[PDB]
Design a protein around this nucleic acid. Structure first.
Ligand SMILES: NC[C@@H]1O[C@H](O[C@H]2[C@@H](O)[C@H](O[C@@H]3[C@@H](O)[C@H](N)C[C@H](N)[C@H]3O[C@H]3O[C@H](CO)[C@@H](O)[C@H](O)[C@H]3N)O[C@@H]2CO)[C@H](N)[C@@H](O)[C@@H]1O
Ligand SMILES: [Mg+2]
Ligand SMILES: [Mg+2]
Ligand SMILES: [Mg+2]
Ligand SMILES: [Mg+2]
Ligand SMILES: [Mg+2]
Ligand SMILES: [Mg+2]
Ligand SMILES: [Mg+2]
Ligand SMILES: [Mg+2]
Ligand SMILES: [Mg+2]
Ligand SMILES: [Mg+2]
Ligand SMILES: [Mg+2]
Ligand SMILES: [Mg+2]
Ligand SMILES: [Mg+2]
Ligand SMILES: [Mg+2]
Ligand SMILES: [Mg+2]
Ligand SMILES: [Mg+2]
Ligand SMILES: [Mg+2]
Ligand SMILES: [Mg+2]
Ligand SMILES: [Mg+2]
Ligand SMILES: [Mg+2]
Ligand SMILES: [Mg+2]
Ligand SMILES: [Mg+2]
Ligand SMILES: [Mg+2]
Ligand SMILES: [Mg+2]
Ligand SMILES: [Mg+2]
Ligand SMILES: [Mg+2]
Ligand SMILES: [Mg+2]
Ligand SMILES: [Mg+2]
Ligand SMILES: [Mg+2]
Ligand SMILES: [Mg+2]
Ligand SMILES: [Mg+2]
Ligand SMILES: [Mg+2]
Ligand SMILES: [Mg+2]
Ligand SMILES: [Mg+2]
Ligand SMILES: [Mg+2]
Ligand SMILES: [Mg+2]
Ligand SMILES: [Mg+2]
Ligand SMILES: [Mg+2]
Ligand SMILES: [Mg+2]
Ligand SMILES: [Mg+2]
Ligand SMILES: [Mg+2]
Ligand SMILES: [Mg+2]
Ligand SMILES: [Mg+2]
Ligand SMILES: [Mg+2]
Ligand SMILES: [Mg+2]
Ligand SMILES: [Mg+2]
Ligand SMILES: [Mg+2]
Ligand SMILES: [Mg+2]
Ligand SMILES: [Mg+2]
Ligand SMILES: [Mg+2]
Ligand SMILES: [Mg+2]
Ligand SMILES: [Mg+2]
Ligand SMILES: [Mg+2]
Ligand SMILES: [Mg+2]
Ligand SMILES: [Mg+2]
Ligand SMILES: [Mg+2]
Ligand SMILES: [Mg+2]
Ligand SMILES: [Mg+2]
Ligand SMILES: [Mg+2]
Ligand SMILES: [Mg+2]
Ligand SMILES: [Mg+2]
Ligand SMILES: [Mg+2]
Ligand SMILES: [Mg+2]
Ligand SMILES: [Mg+2]
Ligand SMILES: [Mg+2]
Ligand SMILES: [Mg+2]
Ligand SMILES: [Mg+2]
Ligand SMILES: [Mg+2]
Ligand SMILES: [Mg+2]
Ligand SMILES: [Mg+2]
Ligand SMILES: [Mg+2]
Ligand SMILES: [Mg+2]
Ligand SMILES: [Mg+2]
Ligand SMILES: [Mg+2]
Ligand SMILES: [Mg+2]
Ligand SMILES: [Mg+2]
Ligand SMILES: [Mg+2]
Ligand SMILES: [Mg+2]
Ligand SMILES: [Mg+2]
Ligand SMILES: [Mg+2]
Ligand SMILES: [Mg+2]
Ligand SMILES: [Mg+2]
Ligand SMILES: [Mg+2]
Ligand SMILES: [Mg+2]
Ligand SMILES: [Mg+2]
Ligand SMILES: [Mg+2]
Ligand SMILES: [Mg+2]
Ligand SMILES: [Mg+2]
Ligand SMILES: [Mg+2]
Ligand SMILES: [Mg+2]
Ligand SMILES: [Mg+2]
Ligand SMILES: [Mg+2]
Ligand SMILES: [Mg+2]
Ligand SMILES: [Mg+2]
Ligand SMILES: [Mg+2]
Ligand SMILES: [Mg+2]
Ligand SMILES: [Mg+2]
Ligand SMILES: [Mg+2]
Ligand SMILES: [Mg+2]
Ligand SMILES: [Mg+2]
Ligand SMILES: [Mg+2]
Ligand SMILES: [Mg+2]
Ligand SMILES: [Mg+2]
Ligand SMILES: [Mg+2]
Ligand SMILES: [Mg+2]
Ligand SMILES: [Mg+2]
Ligand SMILES: [Mg+2]
Ligand SMILES: [Mg+2]
Ligand SMILES: [Mg+2]
Ligand SMILES: [Mg+2]
Ligand SMILES: [Mg+2]
Ligand SMILES: [Mg+2]
Ligand SMILES: [Mg+2]
Ligand SMILES: [Mg+2]
Ligand SMILES: [Mg+2]
Ligand SMILES: [Mg+2]
Ligand SMILES: [Mg+2]
Ligand SMILES: [Mg+2]
Ligand SMILES: [Mg+2]
Ligand SMILES: [Mg+2]
Ligand SMILES: [Mg+2]
Ligand SMILES: [Mg+2]
Ligand SMILES: [Mg+2]
Ligand SMILES: [Mg+2]
Ligand SMILES: [Mg+2]
Ligand SMILES: [Mg+2]
Ligand SMILES: [Mg+2]
Ligand SMILES: [Mg+2]
Ligand SMILES: [Mg+2]
Ligand SMILES: [Mg+2]
Ligand SMILES: [Mg+2]
Ligand SMILES: [Mg+2]
Ligand SMILES: [Mg+2]
Ligand SMILES: [Mg+2]
Ligand SMILES: [Mg+2]
Ligand SMILES: [Mg+2]
Ligand SMILES: [Mg+2]
Ligand SMILES: [Mg+2]
Ligand SMILES: [Mg+2]
Ligand SMILES: [Mg+2]
Ligand SMILES: [Mg+2]
Ligand SMILES: [Mg+2]
Ligand SMILES: [Mg+2]
Ligand SMILES: [Mg+2]
Ligand SMILES: [Mg+2]
Ligand SMILES: [Mg+2]
Ligand SMILES: [Mg+2]
Ligand SMILES: [Mg+2]
Ligand SMILES: [Mg+2]
Ligand SMILES: [Mg+2]
Ligand SMILES: [Mg+2]
Ligand SMILES: [Mg+2]
Ligand SMILES: [Mg+2]
Ligand SMILES: [Mg+2]
Ligand SMILES: [Mg+2]
Ligand SMILES: [Mg+2]
Ligand SMILES: [Mg+2]
Ligand SMILES: [Mg+2]
Ligand SMILES: [Mg+2]
Ligand SMILES: [Mg+2]
Ligand SMILES: [Mg+2]
Ligand SMILES: [Mg+2]
Ligand SMILES: [Mg+2]
Ligand SMILES: [Mg+2]
Ligand SMILES: [Mg+2]
Ligand SMILES: [Mg+2]
Ligand SMILES: [Mg+2]
Ligand SMILES: [Mg+2]
Ligand SMILES: [Mg+2]
Ligand SMILES: [Mg+2]
Ligand SMILES: [Mg+2]
Lengths: 49, 272
RNA sequence: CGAUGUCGGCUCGUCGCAUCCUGGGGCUGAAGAAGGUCCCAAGGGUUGGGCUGUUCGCCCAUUAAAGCGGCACGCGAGCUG
RNA sequence: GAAUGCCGGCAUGAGUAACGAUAAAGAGGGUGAGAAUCCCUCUCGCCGUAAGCCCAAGGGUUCCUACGCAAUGGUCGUCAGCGUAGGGUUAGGCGGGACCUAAGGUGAAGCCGAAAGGCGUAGCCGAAGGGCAGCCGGUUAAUAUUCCGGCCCUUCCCGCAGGUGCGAUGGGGGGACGCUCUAGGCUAGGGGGACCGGAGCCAUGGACGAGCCCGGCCAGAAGCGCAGGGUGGGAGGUAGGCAAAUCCGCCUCCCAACAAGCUCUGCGUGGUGGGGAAGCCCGUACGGGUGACAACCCCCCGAAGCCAGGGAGCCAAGAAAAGCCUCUAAGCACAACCUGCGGGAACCCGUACCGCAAACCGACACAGGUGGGCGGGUGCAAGAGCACUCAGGCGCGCGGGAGAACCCUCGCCAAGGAACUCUGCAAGUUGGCCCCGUAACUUCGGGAGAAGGGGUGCUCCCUGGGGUGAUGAGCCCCGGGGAGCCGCAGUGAACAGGCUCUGGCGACUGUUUACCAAAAACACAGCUCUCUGCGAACUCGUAAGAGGAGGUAUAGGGAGCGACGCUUGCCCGGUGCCGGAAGGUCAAGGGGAGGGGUGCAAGCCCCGAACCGAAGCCCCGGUGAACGGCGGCCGUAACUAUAACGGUCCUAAGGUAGCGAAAUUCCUUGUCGGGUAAGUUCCGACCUGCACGAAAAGCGUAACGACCGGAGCGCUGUCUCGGCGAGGGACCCGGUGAAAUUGAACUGGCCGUGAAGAUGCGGCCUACCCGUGGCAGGACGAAAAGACCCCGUGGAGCUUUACUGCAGCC
RNA sequence: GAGCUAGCCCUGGCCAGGGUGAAGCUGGGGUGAGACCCAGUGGAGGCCCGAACCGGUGGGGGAUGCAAACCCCUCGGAUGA
RNA sequence: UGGUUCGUGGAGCCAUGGGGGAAUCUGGGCGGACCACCGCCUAAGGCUAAGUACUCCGGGUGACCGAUAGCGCACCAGUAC
RNA sequence: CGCGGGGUGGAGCAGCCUGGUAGCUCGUCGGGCUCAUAACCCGAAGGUCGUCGGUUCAAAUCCGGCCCCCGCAACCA
RNA sequence: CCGAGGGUAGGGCCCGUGACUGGGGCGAAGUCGUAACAAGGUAGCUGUACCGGAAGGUGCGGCUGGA
RNA sequence: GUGGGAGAGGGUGGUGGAAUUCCCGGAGUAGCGGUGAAAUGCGCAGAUACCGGGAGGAACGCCGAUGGCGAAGGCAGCCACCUGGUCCACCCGUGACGCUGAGGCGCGAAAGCGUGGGGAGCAAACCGGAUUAGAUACCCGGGUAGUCCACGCCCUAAACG
């Protein structure tokens, strides 16, 4: 059947990107938490040009 | 007149379509004056706030003239009468000698080629606009302003009118389509005649689809729902309500008057 | 009750006898034929359909007879639903 | 030592299940330490509106090559999409960006919000939408509309040359738009040819033949040619197009009425460029040569594509913005702009490979899911359907044998057909086209593919229409008529309704419980009630704001009913809603009679009665397509029986019509009638309706239904009642190799006994040790710390005239 | 968190081929003028058959599956809500 | 209405959203309703070290662990997944 | 089986809960009006209060046991 | 070839019959009431319409077969 | 044909006043309605009676008749348009063109039906109050369809002289 993962580079970027997270206090805290944690990747790596 | 069909299909046996014979050879509209992009959307910034809206034909807005006092004294020739997707009525395309082209909402009896004009001057004829004062008591009228210089707001639906009843210092009394008795300021413009396309009420949609074409989504009964959804939801195999009938939001829907009492508008109203 | 699947049906049977038939027999208000009633006896047999989910039962047409009951109202790691 | 404990390890089942589609394999040779699995050749099979080719998304080294086999590969592996290394992705013209706007996002101005933040005209952002200049060939082991060859275009910038008032983010025009049906000419694509090109071929009985086989194009500026789209021309007047315009709009005289002319595309032609089969020979993993000076032509079919902003009809009435033309404003007119010509300048990113899939989404080389374009040929009425087949690509990464049960999938069956069963569940029968021929009933459309029939192949003769061609040939579609041949059978294989009668429910197409319910449920036109005067009612938000609606009573919200026909009775006492400037009560507040506390006092401080005080409730009316409700007991007619009739008690009033043992009927298989050999079902009746009933509508209703019930015909393996055959497993051999479960076990029957159902205790009987294929009675077999039940002063969702609050409104 | 799913907004795409033959139009018939009736034409429709496509009706398989919804046969809709 | 031990309590004090609304030392607040007396303070402007808190960082020590412990990580771990 | 409600002149209902008095309508009887019946008018009769018990000074009434009648309930399996 | 008829399939008309139901006619002395004939005690009749155990009532207009 | 005449003949548009009902303002009280008699009902929450203003619907007093017109059904305030029949005079024109009429077609009171509007008065049904043995009747108080307009059906009658 159709499963739940339907990859889209634009969606992933607009949805979970560094700039989206930065836009709101909710998201800014996510970066803070991930930084303090020592996460190698703050936001998902969306590729291609 | 109303177009009628033979039952060559079920739902074609009741279905019924407007007569478009008053639609003069001018079916597609007029750029310049209108159209605008019209912005379909069944809801506010976010959430739906009027249920069951959506779908249905794309539209172009015809930006019509609801304040006729710009062109006081300037007459215009009625050039055409065309279909307007965004109202029950039809619209008149008129050419002002000025050059300017406006649409007026098209009254019953309006003929193409006719002369029409607005102002204190203005022969009392079908199509003309006047401040309510100079209009003879008892004449039927439409596109009436509520307060002066604020635009036509009463009687624009197909086949509607108001009748002038009497006067009272600065106000003339109106009898509105609903039957209400209203004091409306003398200085309010209103155009003589009834609205026309009066056979609009006689049309039978005929099937579900037609409803959808006009963007009317299926309306579901409270009875059909559940207690979480509606006061009428549940219980077992059908149910008669079990309380005084209500809206989904709990207010009673048979009888409960809802106009706020202390409206300052009150001292200008005399009926139902 | 940290689970013993619960009606009926189908399939496969098997056991009790307080025996429906067939075999043996005493009494009969048993002429004979055919009955009635009890005793002995399970070796084997104990039909096909209409109705109802039905068990059961009432019919239809037969039969030597159309037996009763137990086996977790026998049998769903066999089936059905 | 136990916690269905936690982590780790190793056991058991067990060499057991499986090895991922029943499209399928065989052989010779090569390579290698090793080959069913790699390479090659021949043979065979499968796909072919794909299982073939091209885009996009996603993926990200998977592409090419060399060297490799520990692991990954469900077996093998010399192979690989795997390991190591190196190589590989070339653009002003394709896509995206130095262009435009859509929804939506952001957001100066501004409005709002405890903070965070929310709203928001302008503008900015935002694309499979608009705008927008490259086609054909050749080369690489791997890239090409990118490199190369040919031919052709676009922007800029600088010059010359000739024109003109040039000139804005501003005005106007244009861009610019729906659905269905389409005309004319073309192209793509295809079919055919005695004509042209071509290596070769006579087999196996005959054919050296107008023979078989293969192939007979592509792109292409200017200029034409042919199709077709676009568009009137002047002169006045001028108050509108938010300044100004010569532009645009409007008005008026003229000249056109036409595509005449201007244009603008499509197609054809075109300077030139380029390709070019079978077959044969080679050595490649694959390609190279020759065939070739290849020829490169004529008919015919023909789009859904092109001309395209084409036409007609219809109603539900069909984006914006820039480029583009034109108008003028500031200004500048040694400026600038338009045209022709040279010359120069032309950036950033993507470009490999996979792409219906072993490379994307499903933990996997997973039988699933994934948008767009091309998708040949014959035959079947047509077609994207079906059978075979081009090109092209595969045989699905375990095999070998065997020929048990049993299972899956498939084929046939005597006689009989529903006797099968909850149910004809399943399966059969039927099946396409053409032509005859069709009942009730009906809303006059239907029911209708009703039912039921006949024709269907091949050959010869005669004949009638078109289309392309000149009015003719041919080629191409449609037809008619007459004789004749063969078979069991002529849509000879593949695709292709079983039918009828009759109830119930719902009008109908539709919608739904993604993953057990597709329905009689939801929806639906339509009906009715009701609220709403516009800063509408109502809905979301604390707000601002927004939806309603750029709508205005023929409108919008809410409720119920649910096409249509006929209809929808009586009850307003209770509840609700509506209407009542009276009265009763009623909070803050006003008011202070009166009292109290301290003060030597002036004072300060408290209570505090009358009375004035809203909504609300009470109270008075209305209101049932508002919540709802719509009786009991006696007696009576000249056979009985029954009761039109009377009496009486009660109510706010005591269910009318219509319907009725029902999707309602307990007693119930009510009682009659019908179908049957027989009928707890069904149908028609009666009415004693436990417990119908008139918009939670009543009674009907043609048409409709993968709805539920009853019957019949047709037909059949459902059945009597089974039998045979096929293939995939099952079994044996080789390779690989799991699982839940598992206190340990050396794990028999009976009769007892035991917590009341014992392999394990007692007694007796039976019983050599170990497997394998099978059947499932048991180990209260596995699986889930029972869902039912109860318990817990456990939790949740829902309700209301439970309590208490809150929003909300008054 | 709406890359699944439900609704809506913006902008694109898709639906082979067959039937049936509504209004309208043209002619004729009729009439004072009509209504109306015949042909021919026309191509309407939550019309019909049926692929693609979107579904999921019945049955069988599958049940440590190919698959945490699949496969086979059968079936609904397919110019429209 | 909050705050204080203070939950309306005899409920002050301190802060305050609403209404009314002064005075400048013979002025004003407080000492738990209120009043008299005796006392204490001087609101409606602001700044002010030190003692006090914590431990990403460096050091020191441990009747602290010794790779299932000790930080999740003694090992390129906030990684693989 | 369980629950709660009901038996009163000839008929249908009151009277009980706050025990002492049994009343209402119809009917029946006698008389009148009428030619005659009814209607109407004037007079009158008529109740072991389902039975068994006792509580009281006294039971239709209050309490128990039966008897008929009416109505509801009988669920989760 | 046609062809008596036979078989199959579906229609049209008529006759008979059927649980039950509708009204009708008729049958000396059963029930309820008083509709009409006298101004029949509400003039009657009437087409239509609604309602009622029944005659019938009432609405609308008409009629003289009434003043 | 010419020249006239009378008429509620028909269709559409428009318009007048009387009265009823309702609302509003005034002034005003204790009863008003109604019948055979009553009661329900309306009325101190300010009725009835009276004045003033407003809205709305319907029917047209007097003229008016035993009268007029039409083929009937039927038609009645006034005005205008559109229009049918009709009678008189003059004897000018045509010249037998005439009468009737199965079917057909059109019209056709009232009630009723459909869709929409309208709804003051009246009023089937329905509800109350009396009356009666009982009244689903007659009398009284309320009251819905309907009565009114448009358009479309319906086709009856003591449609009668
Ligand atoms: N009689 C003719 C038609 O039928 C009905 O009439 C029938 C009945 O109504 C009528 O019944 C009458 C009754 O009215 C009257 N008041 C009392 C009388 N005893 C009855 O009589 C009837 O029944 C008896 C026995 O039962 C028979 O013997 C007698 O013949 C018969 N007429 O008897 C008739 C039967 O013959 C209509 N009423 C009458 O008007 C109609 O036109
Ligand atoms: Mg625009
Ligand atoms: Mg947002
Ligand atoms: Mg609904
Ligand atoms: Mg529900
Ligand atoms: Mg609720
Ligand atoms: Mg129910
Ligand atoms: Mg109820
Ligand atoms: Mg409810
Ligand atoms: Mg248990
Ligand atoms: Mg256990
Ligand atoms: Mg014995
Ligand atoms: Mg004997
Ligand atoms: Mg036996
Ligand atoms: Mg049968
Ligand atoms: Mg059965
Ligand atoms: Mg049993
Ligand atoms: Mg037995
Ligand atoms: Mg038992
Ligand atoms: Mg059992
Ligand atoms: Mg069983
Ligand atoms: Mg078992
Ligand atoms: Mg079941
Ligand atoms: Mg473990
Ligand atoms: Mg085993
Ligand atoms: Mg095995
Ligand atoms: Mg195996
Ligand atoms: Mg495989
Ligand atoms: Mg070798
Ligand atoms: Mg094939
Ligand atoms: Mg790699
Ligand atoms: Mg490779
Ligand atoms: Mg190699
Ligand atoms: Mg391997
Ligand atoms: Mg594998
Ligand atoms: Mg090797
Ligand atoms: Mg590699
Ligand atoms: Mg640049
Ligand atoms: Mg941009
Ligand atoms: Mg932009
Ligand atoms: Mg914002
Ligand atoms: Mg584009
Ligand atoms: Mg481009
Ligand atoms: Mg490549
Ligand atoms: Mg190329
Ligand atoms: Mg090039
Ligand atoms: Mg522009
Ligand atoms: Mg070509
Ligand atoms: Mg040749
Ligand atoms: Mg030979
Ligand atoms: Mg060819
Ligand atoms: Mg060419
Ligand atoms: Mg200007
Ligand atoms: Mg070549
Ligand atoms: Mg066009
Ligand atoms: Mg712009
Ligand atoms: Mg210029
Ligand atoms: Mg590339
Ligand atoms: Mg590529
Ligand atoms: Mg594809
Ligand atoms: Mg594989
Ligand atoms: Mg796959
Ligand atoms: Mg995969
Ligand atoms: Mg697909
Ligand atoms: Mg094709
Ligand atoms: Mg093909
Ligand atoms: Mg073909
Ligand atoms: Mg075909
Ligand atoms: Mg195919
Ligand atoms: Mg091969
Ligand atoms: Mg057989
Ligand atoms: Mg046979
Ligand atoms: Mg048979
Ligand atoms: Mg049977
Ligand atoms: Mg049976
Ligand atoms: Mg059946
Ligand atoms: Mg079947
Ligand atoms: Mg039929
Ligand atoms: Mg034949
Ligand atoms: Mg029925
Ligand atoms: Mg349905
Ligand atoms: Mg489901
Ligand atoms: Mg679905
Ligand atoms: Mg279905
Ligand atoms: Mg289902
Ligand atoms: Mg309806
Ligand atoms: Mg909101
Ligand atoms: Mg708004
Ligand atoms: Mg709006
Ligand atoms: Mg509405
Ligand atoms: Mg319903
Ligand atoms: Mg109706
Ligand atoms: Mg009702
Ligand atoms: Mg009530
Ligand atoms: Mg009331
Ligand atoms: Mg009430
Ligand atoms: Mg009130
Ligand atoms: Mg007070
Ligand atoms: Mg009050
Ligand atoms: Mg009734
Ligand atoms: Mg019955
Ligand atoms: Mg029978
Ligand atoms: Mg029977
Ligand atoms: Mg029945
Ligand atoms: Mg019901
Ligand atoms: Mg009832
Ligand atoms: Mg109801
Ligand atoms: Mg219904
Ligand atoms: Mg029914
Ligand atoms: Mg039906
Ligand atoms: Mg359907
Ligand atoms: Mg269905
Ligand atoms: Mg079988
Ligand atoms: Mg086999
Ligand atoms: Mg093996
Ligand atoms: Mg042993
Ligand atoms: Mg035992
Ligand atoms: Mg033992
Ligand atoms: Mg032992
Ligand atoms: Mg074994
Ligand atoms: Mg087994
Ligand atoms: Mg178990
Ligand atoms: Mg438990
Ligand atoms: Mg439960
Ligand atoms: Mg408790
Ligand atoms: Mg979505
Ligand atoms: Mg088609
Ligand atoms: Mg014609
Ligand atoms: Mg036609
Ligand atoms: Mg069509
Ligand atoms: Mg369709
Ligand atoms: Mg279809
Ligand atoms: Mg396609
Ligand atoms: Mg299925
Ligand atoms: Mg299908
Ligand atoms: Mg279809
Ligand atoms: Mg506090
Ligand atoms: Mg307290
Ligand atoms: Mg304050
Ligand atoms: Mg203070
Ligand atoms: Mg103080
Ligand atoms: Mg102090
Ligand atoms: Mg103190
Ligand atoms: Mg102090
Ligand atoms: Mg200070
Ligand atoms: Mg400080
Ligand atoms: Mg240690
Ligand atoms: Mg550790
Ligand atoms: Mg260690
Ligand atoms: Mg750890
Ligand atoms: Mg007497
Ligand atoms: Mg339960
Ligand atoms: Mg329960
Ligand atoms: Mg014959
Ligand atoms: Mg008969
Ligand atoms: Mg009489
Ligand atoms: Mg009378
Ligand atoms: Mg009478
Ligand atoms: Mg009458
Ligand atoms: Mg009446
Ligand atoms: Mg006249
Ligand atoms: Mg003469
Ligand atoms: Mg005649
Ligand atoms: Mg009539
Ligand atoms: Mg009438
Ligand atoms: Mg009616
Ligand atoms: Mg009507
Ligand atoms: Mg309607
Ligand atoms: Mg009245
Ligand atoms: Mg009356
Ligand atoms: Mg009234
Ligand atoms: Mg007649």
């Amino acid at each position: 059947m159709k499963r739940t993962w339907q990859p889209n580079r634009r969606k992933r970027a607009k949805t979970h990107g560094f700039r989206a997270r930065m836009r709101t206090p909710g998201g800014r805290k996510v970066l803070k938490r991930r930084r303090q944690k020592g996460r190698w990747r703050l936001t998902p790596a969306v590729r291609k040009r | 007149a109303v177009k009628k069909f033979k039952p060559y299909t079920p739902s074609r046996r009741f279905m019924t379509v407007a007569d478009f014979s008053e639609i003069t050879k001018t079916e597609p509209e007029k750029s310049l004056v209108k159209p605008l992009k019209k912005t379909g959307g069944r809801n506010n910034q976010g959430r739906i706030t009027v249920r069951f809206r959506g779908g249905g034909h794309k539209r172009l807005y015809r930006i019509i003239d609801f304040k006729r006092w710009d062109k006081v004294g300037i007459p215009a020739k009625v050039a055409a009468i065309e279909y307007d997707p965004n109202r029950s009525a039809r619209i008149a395309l008129l050419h002002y000698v000025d050059g300017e082209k406006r649409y007026i909402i098209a009254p019953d009896g309006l003929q193409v080629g006719q002369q029409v004009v607005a102002g204190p001057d203005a022969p009392i004829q079908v199509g003309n606009a006047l401040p309510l004062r100079f209009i003879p008591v008892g004449t039927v009228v439409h596109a009436v302003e509520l307060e002066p210089k604020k635009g036509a707001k009463l009687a624009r639906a197909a086949g509607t009118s108001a009748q002038i009843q009497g006067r009272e210092g600065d106000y003339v009394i109106l009898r509105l389509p609903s039957g209400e008795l209203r004091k409306v300021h003398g200085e309010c413009y209103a155009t003589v005649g009834a609205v026309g396309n009066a056979d609009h009420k006689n049309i039978v949609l005929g099937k579900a689809g037609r409803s959808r074409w006009l963007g009317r989504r299926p309306h579901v009964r409270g009875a059909a729902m559940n207690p979480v959804d509606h006061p009428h939801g549940g219980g077992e195999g059908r149910a008669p309500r079990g309380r005084p009938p209500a809206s989904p939001w709990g207010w009673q829907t048979k009888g409960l008057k809802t106009r706020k009492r202390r409206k300052p508008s009150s001292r200008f109203i005399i009926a139902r």
